[PDB]
Amino acid sequence: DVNVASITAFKSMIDETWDKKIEANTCISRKHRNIIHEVIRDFMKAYPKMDENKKSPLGAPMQWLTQYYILKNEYHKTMLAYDNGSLNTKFKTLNIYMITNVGQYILYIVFCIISGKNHDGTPYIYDSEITSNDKNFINERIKYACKQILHGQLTIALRIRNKFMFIGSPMYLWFNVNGSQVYHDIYDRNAGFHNKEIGRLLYAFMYYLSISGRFLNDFALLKFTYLGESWTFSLSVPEYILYGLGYSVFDTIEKFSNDAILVYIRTNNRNGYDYVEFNKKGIAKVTEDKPDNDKRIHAIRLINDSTDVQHIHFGFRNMVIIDNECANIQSSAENATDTGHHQDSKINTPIP
């Protein structure tokens, strides 16, 4: 299953943005984020499982991490061959240190991910490591890969002095990864990344994952699954988390309580957002049409009464959804606001 639509859309995005200089507030638009999100998800879907004769006994998702699988992934092959190979040729000119333009940033980060390559050129996992039963060894390699996607983007942000460019590390790259360790490994060692005008969506993504681990066990209130990769939540779930991890509100969503959730799915005609509400335990299935890339949203406001006041702002309207006006994107409790609801319509391990 090769979704060529996302390939075509990706190529056109790169054409539009190739020569667009990254400035202080520059961010990736809703449309472009949604294209990026589709590309990573469509890459995964094209070769979604390991082969029985070349399988990790740990259950590490080597189909998305190794050349053995990626080189036979038909989405990867079609993407790298598209338009006479033009995107692959562009990609090979790039590295972290020279990137200055939006389309260079997007192409480099994305093509590294869907090629299974670290920024230093090494594969995330070597083919000879696929079958390893050494959990600590494999865990360390995946943690490195996950961190370097984010660290490389922070290095770019600090050099250019940019606030809002952001592509996440997809969920499969968090195999046994401790989000508090990722956060502290990076932030404890570079004071420049703390500047409030630098790397704010990267910060928001990592900060949330530093306080809310992937598997919350009995504290989990929600669970998402895509192609066997699951994640749990007990707070509101900002769009920067769902976009960053590669999850969709059209994925398998399970509720473990009867708290209300508001699942935001699309922009409307009133400078607002449309959402579906769910309350009961079990599967929460959005049956509305999938919006186009220009309009699609992925965000959840969780409503309960035991959420700590220090965490309530993750569900605030203008933080839980990424503003399409780059300069006004919210990224922490200092700037999160919960105003504007009259424009919206109802359609119907770290532990917090």
From Swiss-Prot:
Q: Which gene encodes it?
A: OPG153
Summarize subunit and interaction data from the UniProt record for this chain.
Interacts with proteins OPG094 and OPG143. Interacts with OPG154. Interacts with OPG152. Interacts with host laminin.
Q: What is the effect of changing residue 37 to R?
A: Loss of pH sensitivity in the fusion process
- Where does this protein reside within or beyond the cell? Virion membrane
Q: What is the lineage of its organism?
A: Viruses, Varidnaviria, Bamfordvirae, Nucleocytoviricota, Pokkesviricetes
Could you tell me the keywords of this UniProt record? Disulfide bond, Membrane, Phosphoprotein, Virion
Which start and end residues of the full protein are shown? 17 to 385 of 500
Query: What does it do?
Result: Envelop protein that mediates acid-dependent endocytosis into host cells. Plays an important role in endocytic entry of the virus by acting as an acid-sensitive membrane fusion suppressor. Low pH in host endosomes triggers conformational changes to allow de-repression of viral fusion complex activity and membrane fusion within vesicles. Also plays a role in bridging the mature virion with structural protein OPG152.
Disulfide bond residue pairs:
27-326
GO annotation terms (biological process): adhesion of symbiont to host via host extracellular matrix; fusion of virus membrane with host plasma membrane
Record's protein name: Envelop protein OPG153
